[PDB]
Design a protein around this nucleic acid. Structure first.
Ligand code: MG
Ligand code: ZN
Length: 2008
RNA sequence: GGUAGUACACUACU
RNA sequence: AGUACACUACU
RNA sequence: AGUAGUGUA
């Protein structure tokens, strides 16, 4: 941890050049890690630190009286010992990831100490403390030791040692001897998976083709390699080395040629520019005109928004019946003649209620009351229309189509030519997007929309989002709050809210619409209506009707049918719209999308116009068509390529960009993109980089400058680069998934697949070539690279085969693998004609391969039941299937993604799944070792990897450039020399691969299989036979696609499908070279990595020819490549290098069969983009807008709480990806609004709970009771929706704890709960506490409990609606048929249930046996929810059903009442009322409050830590986020009590045998003991037994299913208790790098409070608590950390800012009276003295005496006499630094000065400076000399306490005169130009005192000339009289900080001028209490306009005038 | 020409 | 209604 | 363990 020791290790690594000493380096590194952990553990435990203390020594120490030689002490050396309570504990520190060494050392030490334990009559305990370096989880075996130490708070980081190990291994990676020397064990191969290999593989036609393709020597080499057995051979790498040596000549020749190409390359690469963009645009428009039908008519446009809107009418009433009457009258009174005017008038007559409004209301109310009285739908009773006036009414807003009221001809005209009901190869018609008239029409449309919608609403901006989240959003960003207020005031919000409400009403009324009825939908607007036409994927037909007084005052986005005159104005009818419920639901959610988009685009940008942003967002948010889809996604490639250094944007536009402009908005956005391309080319040079700050240990202040110089894209303004990237990339997420149509997408996907297959069949005939032919692989280079990479990878780890089998469950059963037991679909081949009934297709097409789709688990059940599969180890069965399954069949379906063209998705059969599983797991485990591979990297860690690569490339650039240009810089401190100096080049190739799986040479994987060392020859033969049979796979065409292709009746021109299928005579097509998408990810990625390694070699050699330095980092996921190249050379310009690098990148991709997408491949100098993730310049960046937009996404629609928890997930992910707090809060508000809208809980609505509960606002109601979340954003991110209860409890603590403990730790504050008075609690608090006590917890719980259930062990759902829903067909499931047979079997259920009781662990864990699996599969069918999931369900239909059933009795209140002490289903409102009634009778007591606190907070260490962070937080100096970084969330529960896996522990507990398969005998015993203790102390077994007994007695018969359910919850709780370290991968973008839990919490809290700036957070006490997950914590930690921080801060502050002489007196004075963090510093000093950590404060102790020479001896042991020390420190006056020897220096570690604000004490008055305020000073404590000398007199005036000082020179004497540090910045001279700033030791003239002197002189001169009221000067007697007047004035009035700072500044000026005597003699002038003339004088004050004091003097005068006027 | 089972949401500062 | 890589919810 | 959702390729 020590930085000097880190430097020492770095020097050892750098200077080392022998692999024999690198082992010494690594061993020393491991010892340093162990000793560091031991020292930190001893500090935490507060025990004296020892290492390898002799056992005889410890025996003598514990028993000095006994004579030595009484017994031979064992030679073992314990790390440390501890003797308390007559028990000796032998402690051993271990820093390992495993327990093998721990257990063997435990056994050895125990055996060797038994004899001494018996003799000396002392029990000896062997305690092994083990820490896991990668996840800091502590493991302790001795429970007695853990009893001694209840809280162990070891919080340390091992990242430094990992970095050194990585540096050593990368330096000596090329040395195979070093790898062998550091290898663990030898090369070991497990037992062969198969006993025999395929003999028919050699006869396979595919193998014959491959063999004939290869030349003869390669055929021989392939046969030898596949027939090679590593275990039999003397060396495993015998054949690998032979092949590598054979191919070395060709490999070296290829590398040398490719390197020689650098000279032949010119400087001209594919630069994007305006000419290329224009030519590409011309080619694109030509291609689009050829492929489409271009229309120049505006009347051919399609609706941009399927809606028309008009402002409301304040004069008219908003009652529903009045609106209906008004609509009927307006429809009837249409004047004029038109096509449908008579139909509209007839409809208005049909809906004419007349004057019988009361009768209509009564009829509708009676119907609704009848409907709502039943949980189920009312059946068998027919609704009969009632005639009211001329209206035949069936329901509210439902009317008959009366044949008498409408002519038949008019009715058919309307229904067919208008609504399309009863209605009934050319090119798709699209508008001309390049036509000037068409673009002018689009501009006119957008201008009209802006004009109509920019006006004010005229109504209150009050709404749910604002009311419930305005405070949070305002505190986060007042500007965001103001933007929201403006948005809600404008008319865009009213229009989109009206459209959403109206569309929800349309969806509600369309469910029960009949064929002869039409519905009327109404919204809050009294002028906007909807008429829903009859309808039967369900569709909705609606027409929007708008009433407006003035014509042309309507908002028409190309949806209007016509505007007609009526009574009292005009009526406008929109054209009929037919939409899918999926698009309708998006429209309903659209307000959230609109608000999110507007706030994202406007955030932190004053140069943008909110009107323009909303004008764009209203169209993108409501876009539900493919027209905008065709533009959003290609825009990324177009604009990003244009900004790039090298890109083929011209070819991209010409060949791929295909705008689909069916709408005027699409035309407008096409023009926007076109302009943005040229602008992006023009403005690529305005990107600038921040000044890098390098500390040589970490990088801070890195990235890209924030200057708004780039032009905005979609709307006028200026943006930063980050905002520009957001504007480029966010629009892709405006698209909607599932917009495609199955018919067309199946046709296109089949066409693409068959076209690729046909092209491969015809054109592609060569497999191996040397000239980089398309779809061809260079054989020699491939083989050589594969050999090299395989050698390196398998040399890295010696047990690769064992690791594969262990991690992939190869040795375990088939039923224990998730991918083989899932509910995903799989293909089944065979005769299934009966189930499928299709008949016509079967008869008409002979060669039809019959197939059916089934679930994976069902297929596994079938194969197990038919004995095709067994429960033997899975790998043996997999290889058996590799031989048996000769024919592979696949089918495909469309993904339905959000891109313009859908993606084909392939489904395979079970045997193919298993074979590919084996191959892919082998490839995966070899990819894990390779650093370049990125699929093996867990998700979201790729951001951290990108950051690390960028940081090391920055460091390499700086170091290499400085090292090379040292000579030139020395010569400078010449222009000709500067010309010839070396320059740095940085290159980022963000690349894409074209047709990764479609066009790939599958033969290159044969070599990967054959050259693999870890496989046996028989395994290789079987796998190669599988691959050969895979290359003969057949694609089964889908039945629906075949149906449509057979129902055409007109022959297609060139039907590729018919050609490939023999004129539709077969449904199967043979696919050979296209390994199917997604099946061979790891293998393809490995070969991609090998290709990039060859590229790296080529680049390194080529740069070697240039005598330069290069660093190449390549990241490869599957087909997405991120290659960054850093070059520092001087021979040639950068253009030649860029051209050469790009040409060789393309050539290297083509060499290995890959093909880079040059259209989508672009080169940048700074920006990295690997997988939707960006690294701007060392600084991580991500588009969190996608997570922000997914806040309104679909959910399970289970209930109000379940729905909310799903969307808070998206909010939290957005927070993790860098979303600012205000936008995160907006997303949370939108999620709450969406849920409340779904369940009709919005304010004022029926299910709104605010009235029924004692709460002022919905923040007071619990989430489970339908409140809104109220908690800090850091809490929401960390604990995740438990934050509601946590925040409520913390607020209760902060409100009711006594003042003495108010600033104590959470455990102490909870211990003080017994003193609470329950009578003082408010009604809301009482209600919430009762809810927590009785609804969340159990009545049996007692405050005396020591262990209890954690919040993760219990659910939170209370009010969940129930639905009467049919299960579905489920006919095709063989397992379901077996389950039905078993159910119909006599009593089979009792046996199956009995088996599940006998093996209860099967309920929660996977079974390890076929019988166990088959029983579980049969059992799951009992649960209704599983069957519902099995049936396909539409989320759109579920959402509408939840809306409709909101008033029906759905809540089962019996279950809720069963929760507390001791009917029919109930509605939401009645449930609220009943819950309040039930809770009224219950009582609450201090005992109950203690139970709540103990069971909610004291259980979880994470909950305790979060509560401590909230209570004890101190917020420091604000600062702008300069350089961000990634940091993963650490583990909050470090202590581990269970070692074994939870499944194994549960299996052992179900039985009583600690000895289980795969379970360590003795290790499982303690886990079983712990689990039994947990069960007994929580009384789970007793509670379950009592519950089942009571239920059995109540029912009268044994409810066996109830017993199963009880066992399920019991084992669920047991599983949650015994769950081990999950170690989730959760990374965060944070202002700084965090290493420990406290650092992470500080960074989270400081980052998630304000949008503008982030704060430094330190904690008053120690936040972390040492405890276990389910054990109560009643012990708080010590204050030693506070003492350490205090005295480190004190020593270093005194050294830095105090003169050498005054330092000791300063220390003594501050020790005597001051206090740190509410703790007296004398007490902290006593803690340090009377403690076992005194070697960290040797200089501090020396200055205060102490030492006693024991500390010096201990320090020497860590590596010196007292008098020698005293003599040596004669010249040194440093409090923090002392010299024990002539060169040895004992020092105290530094602490950040931001914590100095925690010191409180009496003033330290010396000279005129009061040092207390200096410690409290914020500006003047900075270490940099420049920053100190450049501070202001406003800050400096705080330190002035003169009381009669004459000279500032003697006043400032009490300041440090040692040299300070200053930041010197230098340029780098690289193609991306940037400056690095590094602090360096300054010379003598720059000291703290000198900086203060310069500050004083400059600022006082400025202030003097600012306040020379008289012309003579500052010292003139008249000016002095004016100063006397002003000081008397300010003394006479109330003190203000303006007055104080002005007084201090004038005082310091007078001290400089030596006017102090009169200053202290200032009094009221004799000419002056005439307040009138004081006012006259101050109003006559000649205030100057000097800029710093201009605002200051005016404010001071104004405040004085206001105060003196308020006085009178 | 005839036929076309199918119980309910919003109801608002507008 | 697929492979993989995750994350978060509910039972 | 099952189910749902989201992001990624
Ligand atoms: Mg890419
Ligand atoms: Zn003074």
């Amino acid at each position: 941890m020590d930085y000097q020791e880190y430097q020492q290790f770095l020097a050892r690594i750098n200077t080392a050049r022998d692999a024999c000493v690198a082992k010494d380096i690594d061993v020393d590194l491991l010892m340093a890690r162990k000793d560091y952990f031991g020292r930190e553990l001893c500090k935490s435990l507060n025990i004296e630190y020892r290492n390898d203390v002799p056992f005889i020594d410890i025996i003598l120490d514990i028993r000095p009286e006994v004579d030595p030689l009484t017994i031979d002490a064992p030679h073992i050396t314990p790390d440390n010992y501890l003797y308390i309570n007559n028990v000796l504990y032998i402690i051993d520190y271990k820093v390992s990831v495993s327990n093998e060494s721990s257990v063997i050392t435990y056994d050895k030490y125990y055996e060797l100490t038994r004899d001494i334990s018996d003799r000396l009559s002392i029990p000896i305990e062997i305690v092994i403390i083990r820490i896991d370096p990668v996840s800091r989880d502590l493991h302790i075996n001795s429970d007695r030791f853990k009893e001694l130490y209840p809280t162990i708070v070891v919080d340390i980081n091992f990242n430094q040692f990992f970095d050194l190990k990585q540096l050593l291994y990368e330096k000596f990676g090329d040395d195979e001897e070093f790898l062998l020397k550091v290898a663990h064990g030898d090369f070991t191969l497990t037992a062969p998976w198969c006993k025999t290999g395929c003999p028919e593989f050699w006869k396979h036609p595919i193998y014959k083709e491959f063999k004939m393709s290869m030349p003869v020597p390669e055929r021989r080499l392939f046969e030898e390699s596949v027939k090679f057995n590593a275990y039999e051979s003397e060396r495993w790498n015998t054949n690998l080395v032979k092949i590598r040596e054979y191919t070395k000549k060709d490999y070296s020749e290829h590398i040398s040629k490719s390197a020689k190409n650098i000279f032949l390359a010119s400087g001209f690469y594919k630069q994007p520019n305006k000419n290329e963009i224009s030519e590409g645009w011309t080619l694109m428009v030509e291609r689009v005109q050829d492929q489409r039908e271009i229309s120049k008519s505006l009347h051919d446009q399609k609706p941009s928004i399927h809606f028309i809107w008009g402002a409301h009418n304040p004069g008219n009433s908003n009652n529903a019946t009045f609106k209906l009457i008004l609509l009927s009258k307006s429809l009837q009174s249409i004047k004029g003649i038109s096509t449908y005017t008579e139909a509209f008038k007839s409809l208005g007559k049909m809906m004419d209620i007349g004057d019988k409004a009361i009768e209509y209301e009564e009829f509708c109310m009676s119907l609704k009351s009848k409907a709502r009285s039943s949980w189920k739908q009312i059946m068998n009773k027919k609704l009969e229309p009632k005639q009211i006036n001329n209206a035949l009414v069936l329901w509210e807003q439902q009317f008959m189509i009366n044949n008498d009221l409408i002519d038949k001809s008019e009715k058919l005209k309307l229904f067919k030519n208008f609504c399309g009901i009863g209605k009934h190869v050319s090119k798709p018609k699209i508008l001309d997007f390049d036509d000037a008239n068409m673009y002018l029409a689009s501009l006119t449309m957008m201008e009209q929309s802006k004009k109509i919608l920019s006006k004010s609403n005229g109504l209150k901006p009050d709404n749910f989002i604002l009311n419930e989240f305005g405070s949070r959003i305002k505190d986060a960003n007042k500007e965001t709050y103001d933007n929201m207020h403006k948005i809600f005031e404008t008319g865009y919000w009213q229009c989109i809210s009206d459209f959403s409400t109206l569309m929800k009403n349309i969806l509600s009324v369309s469910q029960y619409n009949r064929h002869n009825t039409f519905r009327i939908a109404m919204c809050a607007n009294n002028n906007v209506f909807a008429i829903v036409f009859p309808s039967a994927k369900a569709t909705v037909v609606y027409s929007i009707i708008v009433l407006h007084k003035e014509e042309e005052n309507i908002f028409n986005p190309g949806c209007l049918h016509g505007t007609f005159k009526c009574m009292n104005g005009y009526i406008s009818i929109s054209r009929a719209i037919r939409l899918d419920k999926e698009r309708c639901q998006r429209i309903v959610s659209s307000p959230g999308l609109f608000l999110t988009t507007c706030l994202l685009f406007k955030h932190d940008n004053p140069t943008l116009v909110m009107s323009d942003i909303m004008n764009f967002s209203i169209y993108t948010s409501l876009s539900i068509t493919k027209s905008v889809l065709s533009l959003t996604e290609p825009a990324r490639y177009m604009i990003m390529n244009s900004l790039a250094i090298s890109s083929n944007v011209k070819d991209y536009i010409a060949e791929k960009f295909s705008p689909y402009t069916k709408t005027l908005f699409s035309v407008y956005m096409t023009r926007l993109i076109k302009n943005a391309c040229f602008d992006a080319y023009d403005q690529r040079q305005r990107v600038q980089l921040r000044d890098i700050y390098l500390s040589d240990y970490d990088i801070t202040q890195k990235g890209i400058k924030d200057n708004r110089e780039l032009t905005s894209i979609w709307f006028p303004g200026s943006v930063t680069l980050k905002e520009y990237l957001t504007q480029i990339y966010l629009p892709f997420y405006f698209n909607a998934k599932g917009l495609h149509e199955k018919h067309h997408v199946m046709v296109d996907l089949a066409k693409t697949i068959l076209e690729i297959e046909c092209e491969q069949r015809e054109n592609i005939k060569e497999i191996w070539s040397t000239n980089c032919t398309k779809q061809t692989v260079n054989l020699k280079i491939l083989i050589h690279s594969l050999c090299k990479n395989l050698l390196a990878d398998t040399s890295r780890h010696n047990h690769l085969r064992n690791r594969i089998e262990n991690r992939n469950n190869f040795r375990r059963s088939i039923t224990t693998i998730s991918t083989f037991t899932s509910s995903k679909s799989c293909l089944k081949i065979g005769d299934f004609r009966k189930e499928k009934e299709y008949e016509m297709l079967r008869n008409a097409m002979p060669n039809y391969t019959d197939y059916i789709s089934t679930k994976v688990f069902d297929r596994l059940y079938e194969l197990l039941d038919k004995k095709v599969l067994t429960d033997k180890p899975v790998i043996e069965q997999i290889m058996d299937m590799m031989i048996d399954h000769k024919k592979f069949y696949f089918t495909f379906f469309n993904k339905g993604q959000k891109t313009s063209k859908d993606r084909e998705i392939f489904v395979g059969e079970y045997e193919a799944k298993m074979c590919m599983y084996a191959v892919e797991r082998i490839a995966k485990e070899r990819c894990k070792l390779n650093p370049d591979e990125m699929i093996s990297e867990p998700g979201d860690g790729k951001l951290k990897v990108l950051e690390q690569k960028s940081e090391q490339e920055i460091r390499f650039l700086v170091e290499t450039t400085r090292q090379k240009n040292r000579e030139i810089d020395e010569a400078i401190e010449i222009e000709k020399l500067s010309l010839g100096k070396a320059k740095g080049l940085k290159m980022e190739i963000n690349a894409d691969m074209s047709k990764w799986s479609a066009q790939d040479v599958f033969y290159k994987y044969f070599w990967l299989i054959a050259l693999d060392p870890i496989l046996y020859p028989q395994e290789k033969e079987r796998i190669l036979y599988f691959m050969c049979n895979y290359m003969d796979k057949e694609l089964i065409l889908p039945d629906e696609l075949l149906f449509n292709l057979l129902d055409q009746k007109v022959a297609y021109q060139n039907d590729i499908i018919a050609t490939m299928t023999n004129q539709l005579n077969s449904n199967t097509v043979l696919i050979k070279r296209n390994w199917l998408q997604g099946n061979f990810n790891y293998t393809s990625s490995y070969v991609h990595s090998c290709a990039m390694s060859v590229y790296k070699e080529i680049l390194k050699e080529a740069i070697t020819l240039l005598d330069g330095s290069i660093l190449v980092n390549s990241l490869v996921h599957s087909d997405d490549n991120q290659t960054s190249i850093t070059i520092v050379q001087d021979k040639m310009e950068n253009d030649k290098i860029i051209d050469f690098a790009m040409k060789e990148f393309e050539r290297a991709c083509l060499t290995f069969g890959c093909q880079a997408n040059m259209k989508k491949t672009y080169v940048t100098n700074c920006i990295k983009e690997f997988v939707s993730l960006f690294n701007l310049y060392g600084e991580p960046f991500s588009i969190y807008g996608r997570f922000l937009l997914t806040s309104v996404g679909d959910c399970a629609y289970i209930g109000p709480y379940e729905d909310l928890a799903s969307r808070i997930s998206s909010a939290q992910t957005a927070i993790k990806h860098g979303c600012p707090p205000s936008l995160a809060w907006v997303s949370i508000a939108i999620s709450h609004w969406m849920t409340s809208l779904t369940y009709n809980m919005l304010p004022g609505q029926s299910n709104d709970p605010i009235d029924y509960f004692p709460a002022e606002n919905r923040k007071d109601i619990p989430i489970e009771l339908n409140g809104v979340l109220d908690a800090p954003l850091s809490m929401i991110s960390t604990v995740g929706l438990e934050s509601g209860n946590l925040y409520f409890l913390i607020k209760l603590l902060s409100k009711y704890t006594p003042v003495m403990q108010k600033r104590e730790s959470v455990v102490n504050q909870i211990a003080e709960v017994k003193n609470w008075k329950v009578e003082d609690l408010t009604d809301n608090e009482i209600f919430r506490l009762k809810i927590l006590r009785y609804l969340v917890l159990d009545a049996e719980m007692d405050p005396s409990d020591i262990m209890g259930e954690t919040s993760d062990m219990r659910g939170r759902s209370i009010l969940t609606p129930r639905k009467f829903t049919t299960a579905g067909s489920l006919r095709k499931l063989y397992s379901f048929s077996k389950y039905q047979d078993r159910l119909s079997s006599p009593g089979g259920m009792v046996e199956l249930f009995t088996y599940l009781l006998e093996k209860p662990e099967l309920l929660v864990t996977k079974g390890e046996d076929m019988k166990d699996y088959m029983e579980s599969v049969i059992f799951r069918y009992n649960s209704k929810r599983f069957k519902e999931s099995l049936s396909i369900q539409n989320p759109a239909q579920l959402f509408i059903e939840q809306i409709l059933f909101s008033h029906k009795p759905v809540i089962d209140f019996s279950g809720i009442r069963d929760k507390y002490i001791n009917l029919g289903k109930v509605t939401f409102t009645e449930a609220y009322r009943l819950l309040m009634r039930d809770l009224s009778s219950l009582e609450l007591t201090n005992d109950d409050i203690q139970v709540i606190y103990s069971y909610i907070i004291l259980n979880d260490p994470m909950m305790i830590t979060i509560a401590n962070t909230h209570i004890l937080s101190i917020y420091g100096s604000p600062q702008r986020r300069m350089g961000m970084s990634c940091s993963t969330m650490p583990e909050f529960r470090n202590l581990k009590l269970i070692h074994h896996s939870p499944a194994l522990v549960l299996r052992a507990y179900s039985k009583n045998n600690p000895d289980i398969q795969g379970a360590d005998p003795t290790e499982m015993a303690r886990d079983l003991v712990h689990l039994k203790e947990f069960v007994e102390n929580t009384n789970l077994e007793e509670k379950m037994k009592v519950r089942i007994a009571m239920n059995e007695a109540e029912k009268g018969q044994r409810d066996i299913v109830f017993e199963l359910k009880e066992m399920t919850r019991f084992y669920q709780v047991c599983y949650e208790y015994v769950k081990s370290t999950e170690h989730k991968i959760k990374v965060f973008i944070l202002p700084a790098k965090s290493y420990t839990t406290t650092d992470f919490c500080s960074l989270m809290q400081g980052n998630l409070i304000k949008d503008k700036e982030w704060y430094t957070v330190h904690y008053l006490k120690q936040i972390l608590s040492g405890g276990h997950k389910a054990i109560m914590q009643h012990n708080a930690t010590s204050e030693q950390n506070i003492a350490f921080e205090c005295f480190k801060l004190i020593t270093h502050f005194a050294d830095s800012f105090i003169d050498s002489l005054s330092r000791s007196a300063f220390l003594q004075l501050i020790i005597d009276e001051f206090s740190y963090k509410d703790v007296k510093v004398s007490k902290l000093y006593d803690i340090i003295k009377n403690g076992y950590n005194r070697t960290d404060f040797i200089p501090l102790l020396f200055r205060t005496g102490d030492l006693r020479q024991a500390d010096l001896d201990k320090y020497d042991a860590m590596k010196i006499l007292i008098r020698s020390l005293d003599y040596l420190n004669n010249d040194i006056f440093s409090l923090s630094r002392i010299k024990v020897g002539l060169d040895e220096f004992a020092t105290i570690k530094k602490a950040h000065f931001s914590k100095m604000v925690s010191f409180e004490g009496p003033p330290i008055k010396t000279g005129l400076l009061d040092l207390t305020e200096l410690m409290k000073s914020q500006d003047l404590l900075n270490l940099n000399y420049d920053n100190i000398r450049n501070s202001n007199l406003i800050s400096f005036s705080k330190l002035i306490c003169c009381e009669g000082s004459d000279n500032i020179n003697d006043g400032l004497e009490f300041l440090s005169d040692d040299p300070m540090n200053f930041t010197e910045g230098e340029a780098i001279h690289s193609t991306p130009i940037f400056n690095i700033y590094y602090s360096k030791r300054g010379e003598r003239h720059m000291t703290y005192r000198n900086a203060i002197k310069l500050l004083i002189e400059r600022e006082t001169k400025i202030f003097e000339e600012a306040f020379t009221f008289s012309e003579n000067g500052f010292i003139s007697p008249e000016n002095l009289g004016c100063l006397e007047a002003v000081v008397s004035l300010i003394k006479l009035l109330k003190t203000n900080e303006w007055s104080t700072v002005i007084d201090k500044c004038i005082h310091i000026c007078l001290i400089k001028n030596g006017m102090d005597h009169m200053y202290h003699s200032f009094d009221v002038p004799k000419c002056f209490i005439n307040w009138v003339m004081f006012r006259e004088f101050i109003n006559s004050l000649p205030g100057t306009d000097i800029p710093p004091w201009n605002v200051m003097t005016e404010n001071f005068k104004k405040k004085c005038i206001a105060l003196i006027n308020s006085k009178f």
